[model samples]
Target chain A: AFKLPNLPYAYDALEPYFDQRTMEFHHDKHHNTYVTKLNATVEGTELEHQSLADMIANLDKVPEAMRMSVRNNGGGHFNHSLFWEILSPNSEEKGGVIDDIKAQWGTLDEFKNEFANKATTLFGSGWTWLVVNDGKLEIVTTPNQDNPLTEGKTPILGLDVWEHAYYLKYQNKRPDYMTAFWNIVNWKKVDELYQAAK
Target chain B: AFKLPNLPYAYDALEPYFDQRTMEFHHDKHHNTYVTKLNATVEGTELEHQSLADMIANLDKVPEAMRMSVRNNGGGHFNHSLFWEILSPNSEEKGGVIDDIKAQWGTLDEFKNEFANKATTLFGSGWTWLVVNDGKLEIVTTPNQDNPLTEGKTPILGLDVWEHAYYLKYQNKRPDYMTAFWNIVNWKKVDELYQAAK
Candidate 1:
């Protein structure tokens, strides 16, 4: 059965940017429930042997009745896992895709501005990703817990634009949370994922 | 220009259920922005004279370049306008279609259970509504600031399922918010709308 992963750092570790209470609710209540539902739906089924990531990647093979539940729950499980793993209080210059980004978009700030635009303009509940698509760097948005993997791409960095992610601290100001998120990103881990995927 | 309608009651009027801060943020910031964007998108264009409700009901007539913007912003304008008006601290048993609801669902609690189920299960940012469709009462959901008017149905009662709507007080427990919402409904006004539409 799939289980909720523990946060790599304390809830307060990334504070002054991401608040402690929001982190606690988001992980303890939100992500925990997703894992619980995914397990309740998948356990004792023929699909029980597959990994969550594998199930998400091969969603077409899932039973139609339960496919959306897996898509939502399994996708939530994997995406939040990556989201937690790639967030850290240490290391800003750990370096992997800075040059790649600058080469593609001319400056890091330019890439950020464009990314923030896509993230802000996404119509509804969703996440924005910096993904490796077709052996190249790309930025995309997926609605409602969907992941890049399901679309044949590998996401190395992701930012959740769901209102729950930041509404407690920054009410109706999504751009503010997007701005602060830059403070705690685990660049080193993002580099590792980028290298592996690219 | 489309303007944000003042809440029919004071922001604190729905307290202990809706909370003051959320009402202020929801109206002053969120709904205000939608109205502003709607004006900016429609002003000085052929669409300027069109009412927000008409624009949403006749979405196919909107230009291709701006249809989505109008759908989201205009839909937001009309939906929230109706939402604020139907909420009151005063009315409970003023009555319109109670007999119809009971006849269809066997009891008011059964009707509420079915409505609450649809509201809770909605996948993303959206609203669950009690609407008049084909001159009969029906429950339906529309995603991301969308409305039933686009589908030729008249919405009488709506429950916003967007995370920002309840995350402040209820956190992850949407069911609690749904349960509390029953206390503040304006049954008299719902009857008026139901009579006019049905």
Candidate 2:
């Protein structure tokens, strides 16, 4: 059975930016639901023993009757797992990926602008990703539980653009939430992922 | 240029089920953004004077550069306008569509179950619809601001499954939100649309 991973930080750890109550609901309720549902979907099936990442990456292998359940809940579980890990209250002092981003996009602000534009302009529930594609960093967007990993790219960093990610704190101002997200991003973890991808 | 339409009822009218804060943000901020963006997307273009419904129904006619904007924001405007019109605090007393639903699905409760299943199971941002196809009622879903109207079907009713629709009140319990929607649905309006389709 898939299990919900505990948040690395306290519910209020990302306060004023990510907020406490939203985290409570987002992790405890949303993430937990995905875990339980994914477990239910894969139980008694060939997929029961597959790793979460494997299930997400090879969605076509899942039984047609259960493909969508695994895709949605499996993707949900995997995405939130990474999301929780790559956020920290002490992220303001973090700084490894910044140099790489600056090198690629000229300035951190320019990268932020591009990232923010993709997140803002994305029309529906999805994620905006900074991925290592062909040994170079690229910004990509995917609709509904899909990730660059599904398309053979390595996601170094990602931002959830689904309204649930920020509706309570940022409401309709997704641009504001995108801005706030930069302050809490664990660049240390992102840099590690980037290096691993290379 | 398209203008945001005012809510037919007071923001507090759907109180206890659909909250005031959600309604305010949903209409003023979310809906208004679509109207403004739709206008910007179509300005100085051939689609500038086309009606909202026309723009959506004939999306192929739109310039490739502006098709996505009209599809997303234009569909947003059209969908929300109908969403507001087909919701009412007093809908518990409204009952015209019950018999039609019963005829189509054997019972209203059965139809609700099917619709709830679709809404709950939909993997990402989208809508669940009750629509007419060749004089028969059907349940259909479309992803990312798409509607049945684009496919030559007549939508009698629709439910927005985007996280923003229920994240504030229902959080991750979308099933609970789907359950609560029954309480405030304006069956009178659905029945009217059903009849008009014939």
Candidate 3:
């Protein structure tokens, strides 16, 4: 069974931007439920012994009847695990990924604008991601608990645009939440993921 | 331009069960955006002259390039309009559609249990609906702003499972919000919709 990991920082560490109450509920309840459901779905099956990444990256190995359960529950587990890992109290304004983003988009502000536009315009519960695709960096969005891994991409950074992620604080104003996310991004960890993906 | 309709009751009218704050933001902002976007999407196009129902019920008439926009925006307009209409501060335990539900599900509580089951199991943002399909009453669900009409079903009553509908008051405990929704359903309005659908 996959275990729910503790938040690397205190619940209130990303104060003023991400409130403590949302963090606590989102982590303890929402994220844990995904891990529990994924575990339950995989139990008694050979998939239980497979690594989470392997199971996710190779969905054809899963039976069709339970593919959706694994897709959603497993995707939820993977997405939220990465989501918490990439968030930090002391996010840098200029960092490793920022330079790569500048090379691609001409400036950090332009990259941010493009990311914000995608996050806000995503129609439903999903995520916007910065991923490594065949050795190239790209921005992508997926619906529900879908992950870029399914499409053969390596996600280095992501933002959850689901209402459960920000409705308590930002309500319908998702753009505000997207803006605040930059303040708390764990750039160091994102860099590590990017380096590994390459 | 399609205009947003006023809530039949005041924002605070269904308080304690459905909070006043959620009502205000949901109707004034979220629901209004759909109307605004729908109007913009159809403006000066031939679709502008078509009835909202016609445009929604006949998506083949919508060009592929703009079909998703119309589907999301139009579905949002139709769904939320029904949502606000079916919520009442004083709902009846036995009413117009109750007999049909009793006939099908054996008991009101049984039908509610089924509804709650579907709503809770739905992995992401969407709605649970009581729809009329081929002149028969049935329960169904659609994702994002997808309405049953697109699938050739007539929705008489719907529960918005989107987190924005309940996040502030119920947080991640969507089951709590689903349970509370029972208290404020306007069965009289739902019956009218059922009869009209027939």
Candidate 4:
């Protein structure tokens, strides 16, 4: 079974936006359940021993029955791990990793608006990302759990717009969720991810 | 300017699940953006005077306000309005007007799991919906710009599984996202919606 991840901060730490109860159910019950089911599904199968990266890297080799479970659970595990690592509780202390968005996109607001536009315009359940592709930061979107890493881009930041994340709180209001997300972003963690990508 | 509605239900009404930040932004920013931009786009045009539902009901009557602006903005307005009306922050009333769930799928859990499964399984950006057709509740998925109403169903309940909805919190783990959604569903609205449809 998948182990519940230790949240970097307390459940209530993300308060005012992220509530304690939401985090508790999201982490302890929802995430852990994926791990448990995934492990059980893979038990006694050759796929059980392979790491998530290995499975994704060689997706074609997985057996048909195990293929979906890996895609679902493995993607779940990998995505959440990265998602947790890249955010901070607030943006007061750390400036974003952007050295000069103006140098890239003419202005910070323009870059932000562009990012928001792409995020909102994305067709369906997928991710809109800010990534270092060919050593330059570019914003993009990927369908489902497919990430920039799979396409050889280095991810710096990501936004997920699936209903479950914000439905109870935002309902159909995804843009608002994205807006507030900027406040609590962990630029420190993002910079580290960027440096490692290079 | 359109005013943002205070959530009809209390912040914690969807307790043990949705957080305050999610709802605040969803309503204020996301939904309000649609209302704000929509009114702006239609300003000085004949369309401005019509309710969003009226505009949608007569798409051809819209004066040119940039290509698809009416459809996109108008749809956004109509969709968000219905989205807000259909959802409840209340969890106590899990029963809905559509009795078809039990008749068709045998139980609410079965319906939910199947609906969630279909939503997660969608290969790209889209919506998972519980729509009413011929007096029955059915699960359906639609790609960009396609609402169940356009596809000839009376959309009873819909979920935007789009990455923007969940990527911030759940990332690539859509199943985790779906699981937590069960806690905050406004069954009261759904039940009433179903009753009204019939």
The sequence of per-residue lDDT tens digits that candidate 1 reaches over residues A15-37 is 89999999999999989988988
Give residue B27's lDDT in candidate 1 (0 to 100): 91
CA error at residue A20 for candidate 1, angstroms: 0.8
**TM-scores for every predicted model:** 0.98, 0.94, 0.97, 0.57
Question: Tens-digit lDDT track for model 2 on A54-88?
Answer: 77778787789998888788888888898898898
Q: Cα deviation of A136 in candidate 1 (Å)?
A: 0.8
Off by over 4 Å in 2: A92-96, B92-96
* Between candidates 2 and 3, the TM-score winner: 3
Off by over 4 Å in 4: A12-22, A57-69, A89-113, A116-126, A160-184, B1-145, B149-198
User: For residue A6, what is the lDDT in candidate 2?
Assistant: 93
Model 4, A20-82: lDDT tens per residue?
665665567656755776787778888767776677666667888887777766666666667
Candidates 1 and 2 compared by lDDT, better number: 1
Indicate which candidate wins on DockQ: 3
Worst 10 residues of 4 chain B by lDDT: B90-99
- TM of chain B, each: 0.97, 0.95, 0.97, 0.82
What is the docking quality class of candidate 4?
Answer: incorrect
DockQ of 2: 0.77
> DockQ scores for all the models shown?
0.84, 0.77, 0.91, 0.20
Compare candidates 1 and 2 on TM-score and give the better one.
Answer: 1
Clashes of 1: 0
Error of 3 at A111 (Å): 1.1
Candidate 1's residue-wise lDDT over B67-179, tens digit each?
99899988888888988988998857547577778878888899899999999988879999999998899999999998999999999999888999999999889999999
Residue A94 displacement (Å), model 4: 7.2
